[PDB]
Amino acid sequence: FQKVVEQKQMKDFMRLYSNLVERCFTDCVNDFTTSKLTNKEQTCIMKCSEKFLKHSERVGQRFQEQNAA
């Protein structure tokens, strides 16, 4: 199909988002004395978000190059 691709693409996007959320929650949120993110936890999530998306971008680029071969 092609319709599968559009769906698979949607599922793929829902993937990153999810994995990203989980990645950054695991590395940044360690205090549960409250129900809200501190200042530090948001910054940490900011950096984690960036680092992960960048990393995820780079690997995607290499993945395409080596994929054509």
Binding site: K3, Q7, M10, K11, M14, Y17, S18, L20, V21, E22, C24, F25, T26, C28, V29, N30, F32, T33, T34, S35, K36, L37, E41, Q42, I45, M46, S49, E50, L53
Partner: protein, 69 residues
């Protein structure tokens, strides 16, 4: 649209997946099994509430980070 309903499959897909990451994540953050007794104690109980809350706060946070870049 018949394929549009695919959204339910797609959405409920991310809703189920997220809930599962939530369950596993918050278990690691809040549950100590060492010499523990099958009952979920008060401290573990509140940790969970706050954990579940910061996880959603983290979602939006990470959601706004992807929207920025």
């Amino acid at each position: 649209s018949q394929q549009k309903i695919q959204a339910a499959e797609a959405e409920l897909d991310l809703v189920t997946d997220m809930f599962n990451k939530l369950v596993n994540n918050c278990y690691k953050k809040c549950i100590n099994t060492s010499y523990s007794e099958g009952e979920l104690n008060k401290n573990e109980s509140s940790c969970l509430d706050r954990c579940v809350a910061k996880y959603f706060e983290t979602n939006v946070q990470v959601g706004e980070n992807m929207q920025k870049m």
